[PDB]
Amino acid sequence: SEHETRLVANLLENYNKVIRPVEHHTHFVDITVGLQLIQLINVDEVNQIVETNVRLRQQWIDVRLRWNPADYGGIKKIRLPSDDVWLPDLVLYNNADGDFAIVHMTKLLLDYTGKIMWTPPAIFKSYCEIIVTHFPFDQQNCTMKLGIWTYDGTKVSISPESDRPDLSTFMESGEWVMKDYRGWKHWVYYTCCPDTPYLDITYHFIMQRIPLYFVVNVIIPCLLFSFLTVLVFYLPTDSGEKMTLSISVLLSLTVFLLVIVELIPSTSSAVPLIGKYMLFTMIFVISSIIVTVVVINTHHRSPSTHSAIEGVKYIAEHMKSDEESSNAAEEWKYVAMVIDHILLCVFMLICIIGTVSVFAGRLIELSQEG
Amino acid sequence: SEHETRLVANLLENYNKVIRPVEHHTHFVDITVGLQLIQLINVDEVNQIVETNVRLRQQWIDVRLRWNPADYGGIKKIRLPSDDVWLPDLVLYNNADGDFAIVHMTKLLLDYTGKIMWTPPAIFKSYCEIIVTHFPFDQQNCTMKLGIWTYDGTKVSISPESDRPDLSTFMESGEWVMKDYRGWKHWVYYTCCPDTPYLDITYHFIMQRIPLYFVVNVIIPCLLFSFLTVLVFYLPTDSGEKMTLSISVLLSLTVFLLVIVELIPSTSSAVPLIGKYMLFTMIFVISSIIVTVVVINTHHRSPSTHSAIEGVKYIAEHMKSDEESSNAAEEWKYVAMVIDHILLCVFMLICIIGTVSVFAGRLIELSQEG
């Protein structure tokens, strides 16, 4: 009735969607964008991939949508199908590893005035730095910039809207934890061209990682392997009679940790970390080797411990006396004294380089913990 | 010429593609299915997924396609492309994991009368029972139902076309082998509704698995281990000098058995074999286990083995004699009389367990081979 056909028909004829509501030679199209992140289903620290969801809160205006008693009058705020809208090719600058999903075919907010918004529950795969410095105790801030794709400032402009945390809806099931999340705006003009280029929203995710699983198993075999090394040292005192035995456990030990480092490379390259870390294990453990090097080398360090009838009685006890001073010789080498210095020499030195391992390890977390 | 343009155009105009050749309220559109798997590309019994070749022979009649001398008179039977045709939403009931491949935009043939065939060269993704009962020697019958998807026996009805084997084009590259396969028709009415529901083609795949390479590698390290454990029996009774030497083997071999476990369970996880297959290895492998532990604990079972001048001579001779005694004691420890018992004790055990393992092996091989 109320100009029924005359009102919707006229609207379709002199209305265009390819076009953008450009208003004179000025501020561009006033684009209002923001992140409304409520779920992070999957991400990989190793490949620095993030498939999350953020409703793309857009907000801008088009006067052409203003109306009178025949559209506003009908029902104040009316929601129009998005099609009529010029949709920006937004995209994650150093990210964007995936299409935004669920934005197409959606609803658009129109007002009596013209105000309009459309928050799409967009889910997509991203790509931002985490590098080997992603999961430390001291974190890294993933730089995530977002802004118009193929359109320059001379035609469209976006700007932040509000600060909101990253932990506002951060994953409690994450193998990480957040500290802070900031987002400020800017416009990037480049020395290349004298022109005024695109605008963008730069997010920075500051959060420390690393569950403690890998941690528990790195140190258990270490203390346990330090038990066998400790045995390594104590045995020659309490059972040097098993120095070879010691040898067996070094083939044991060695293969075990040489195999421990196998795990590392798989896990490490399977889950990212700053190399500076493995350096700890490196020398500390090459230390058990450097030390078993010297210690068992030293352990094996020693030459071989690693009438006339009255006459033969004398040729005989002679036979015995010769050998007796001789057996004294092999014991002359296994003095059972330096064995105690070697375990204590190294017990302290491992208690110290262990305490050294313990040192930067805890110093670094007296830095992280912060 | 012969009403040339008038012929062709008329036909286009009054004809709605989407219309289904409904003929009064009765017989439904009579449409028959007929699947001929030309061949199979690949299957995963574990995930019960197959990629197969299917030429779907689809038949139905559209009395609207009958002609006179200006269509049939032109050239008896001819080639009309699909599009214009109402395509039954064919669907493999408990299967259907994938879209029909090459079903789309193909052609069909119309007769001077009307009868049409639609037989596009398909190959698709399937989903049939395999259950943990498919890899058996006694197989399982892959229950695969096919029929009209969103239309009822009142709107339409899918019927069968003929009998044919599944091993007719069974893959010779399959890790499995066929017994037989049959398919009979059925109409499914549900106690739900008093209505008469869709029709269906039910496939039954009866095939037994396991390519023979596997067979040889595994049972031979067993008779292998059989001999080392066989030696584990004979080595001790014929020479207890290398008891510990065998200590080694016991380590090297159960670990061999341990690592064989990684390999064959992934096989297990690679191919679904009825778990009752697992118990073979269970007791078999585990007797290697219970037998060792006893055999070698027993191997181990043994306490330590695993005038006046004349008098001088007798106090000295007396010294040699009671240590004489002592020597015999520890030997009175490791006797060679029952190590022979354990030898035949268990070898009969092994020839029992073994022949018992061969039992059910042989038995259902008396069923499978048939």
Added chain:
Amino acid sequence: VNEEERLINDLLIVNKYNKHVRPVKHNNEVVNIALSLTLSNLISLKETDETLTTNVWMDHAWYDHRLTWNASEYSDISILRLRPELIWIPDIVLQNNNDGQYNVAYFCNVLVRPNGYVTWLPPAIFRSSCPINVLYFPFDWQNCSLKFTALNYNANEISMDLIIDPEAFTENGEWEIIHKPAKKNIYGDKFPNGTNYQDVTFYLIIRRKPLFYVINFITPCVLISFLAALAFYLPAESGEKMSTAICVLLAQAVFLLLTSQRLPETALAVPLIGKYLMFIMSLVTGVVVNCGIVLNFHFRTPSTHSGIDSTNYIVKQIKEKNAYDEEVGNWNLVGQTIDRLSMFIITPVMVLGTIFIFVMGNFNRPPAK
């Protein structure tokens, strides 16, 4: 309104303009088309199979003579947009690297200049089979060659004239980008009786190799080598650890074998040259050999591996007698040979160990040449 309705009706892009017709002012020499290549990122490298996934900004230019506008088009706005289906777009084919169709570098928004000149330049996620060859491993690490251009048109329907590769080289690559030259061209061939399609030829000369595999891999060698090295020092300090010494062979042996096993694994993932792979396995074999040597050399020697007077003389007899046995063994000991053994172990380790980093250098000098 300045004739605008009428004029874009004049252009009607799709209806008045021939989009299926390329405005090359009809049959002549060609439409002056120019391509610009800028890599935005390199995400994956596969040295072994000569395949690369890389992103490029497909900067394209050509003048659309039917695109020239007037006041209510041209001057109304000396720059405006028009989709791909309403803009002639060159059929740029990645000549030797498009064996993986181009993505979102396809039918995308283009830029409309005022006097027909048009500008289309979107992002290209692509896969390529660059000139790796088994020569993309020596230190020069070859030169990856790539040609870009409008596939469909020839030298009388298209002319494309002509940026560093490391400008957006990926920093997470296991290689190093040394240079990237750019020069266009045009070329006919033998079976073709006419010239055609001009193209963007861009050679990428790179290099790669870790300074990390060297770390944990040679590390065990001087560590392991000292074991085999000590192996021969240890036969002296205490060769009596026969069985236990034997244990270590099993143990240094199992260590050796799968170490080599990890080697091809990463190998297949990387086409490794024959020159380097031998020094690795040649030298571990050097120890393998000497482990076998260890064997024999360590277990090689055949053995080292008046009545009252009457009675005691019996003993002095048994005395001396087995003293001959006792000594038959030290005859075998071979101890004045000891130092020479471990001296002639030192000398060779020095010879070979040096031979390698000697060779390391004799090939390290000429590339630096």
Added chain:
Amino acid sequence: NEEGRLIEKLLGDYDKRIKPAKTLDHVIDVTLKLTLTNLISLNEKEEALTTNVWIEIQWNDYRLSWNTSEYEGIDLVRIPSELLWLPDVVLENNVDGQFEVAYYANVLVYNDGSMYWLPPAIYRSTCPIAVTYFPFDWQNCSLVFRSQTYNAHEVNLQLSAEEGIDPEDFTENGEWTIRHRPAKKNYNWQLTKDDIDFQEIIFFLIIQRKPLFYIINIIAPCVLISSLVVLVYFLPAQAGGQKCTLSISVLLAQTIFLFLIAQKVPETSLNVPLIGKYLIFVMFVSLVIVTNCVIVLNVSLRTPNTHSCVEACNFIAKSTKEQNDSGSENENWVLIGKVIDKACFWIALLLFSLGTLAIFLTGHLNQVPE
């Protein structure tokens, strides 16, 4: 019967994107329901699943009740997707993958304007299973889905039984089990502070799992392992002198086996979900096995060393006898095995306790949630 004219009449006025809403203040009556039919992928560690859902869609639009030529003709009509209001379905908390074959399918228009439609959908989702779902007490999978397009003031969804099931067609090849499926029809107001409620569909699924296959692979090895170490423990009393190192060979072998296990099943939990309780008993019953194990060598480590002319010379020789005797005496006071024998019974009952502590508690963590 105006059959042609009628079809042509409404199609004249026929409106696509407009909802069959009587007016605008009381929404339309939309019916929905889901019958599970396929639970294709359970990745609980990441909390995601894929299911073929029967999306039972139903609503009302008399915008097409017909006359004698269509309603009466047949109280049943199958008209194309794109031809009536369609609920773009999705699971708020679950659907992480746009529905597949869940749309664009033939709907159903009876004669009074009743609309019925049911496409099958394979899609991805994310239900609970957050550091829990691996117990014996189960985390109820709660999936709510609704149209993600409009909000309940125009649209209204209905449902049915909230008491009756997910195991209706719960997969038999799942490594789990379901015991109840509750479902509620509700309004929209969440933690996030959204208003204007768009009703949704809650899907509870408290299910069981844990049908261990790995259990006895774990149970027999440990007993064999425990016995092996108890071999280490009691075998010494039985074993000869050349057994101290014998025992060692076992430690090497015992843990080669150990961490290999530590590498095997840890992998297990990463590819599938995770939980620490069951995890605690293993590694710590395991660490205690290791503990008393190395303790044993430290036990077979402990002890000090077990780890006239005639007569003048007859005098001294009778001394070597008593002299060396004093020495062999050494052996005595040193190797009088009070600690060792008792160490057997030490670990024995400690064995019984570690075992009882664990299997008794495993009895409990199966018996409270039973």
Added chain:
Amino acid sequence: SVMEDTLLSVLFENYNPKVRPSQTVGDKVTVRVGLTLTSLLILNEKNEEMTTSVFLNLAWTDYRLQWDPAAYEGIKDLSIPSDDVWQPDIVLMNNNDGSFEITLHVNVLVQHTGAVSWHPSAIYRSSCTIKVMYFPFDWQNCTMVFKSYTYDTSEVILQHALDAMINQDAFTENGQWSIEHKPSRKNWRSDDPSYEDVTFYLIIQRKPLFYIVYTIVPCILISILAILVFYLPPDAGEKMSLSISALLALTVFLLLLADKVPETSLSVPIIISYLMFIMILVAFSVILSVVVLNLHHRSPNTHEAVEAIKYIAEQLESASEFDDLKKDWQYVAMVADRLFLYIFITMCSIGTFSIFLDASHNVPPDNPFA
């Protein structure tokens, strides 16, 4: 001008897009098919899968597109998108294991009197019988059959270029293989009315010599320790135990080798040849080392008054040295020598045999390069 608008018009007025450049049922349109290969990227020699790339040069004549003054005589050559001609929806009877990439929907070269040139490069997923017979030096040949998947040769004839063109014409330099020749023969199996596919022969030769090299070292180096363990007996009889250590070690090594071999053929298997006999060579060193182990086992042991005391002394020593002298008689070294040279025969015989087979395998089955 010369009736340009006219021609131009009439053409598009009368021209039929979806029609075949032929007149009725006859000799049809003789389409030219000929592909200049680019290169090949992946040969899955194990499943007989082939992903290559080439140019689809098609060309026939459209006497329906012959132009006149301006487009014919104006510009004898002009480019125009396909989409307007029957396109060989070509599939490969064996191969065509997947869709077309850069194959259809691309522009074409149209000549004045109707000639049509379309040269598109494409990647195509194929599958040829490289079977598990792609490794014998005699290798094999394959059938590559190209042809459409909805059309039947009735309204067109297919015709080729060369048959010698070769496939090494664009053989991948990246191929661990090599090629001798490519036969091309036109076919029309009479099992189908539709004249169809063309068989293309691959007389392929794939010789990647890289790891069999260090595989030889095992066989021989393992032999080092082998001949060594067979040499160690009369080298260091005490080898007695250490010997067994060797085989534990030797067997684990070969079993790990067993580990890499199945997973490596896992992607490129063919005849057993190499494995067939190295399998025997395996069994050989395996059993030889184990029976030598039984060679090792076979040994049940190895594995006046004044003067009276004297006399009692005389008998003590002598009496038991014969006893231990008996042990000499028992463990002499006859066998070791004899079988260490039976070791000579065995190992150098079975050695020069596979040496030979291998010898015969690379030279003898090499010339069937055809």
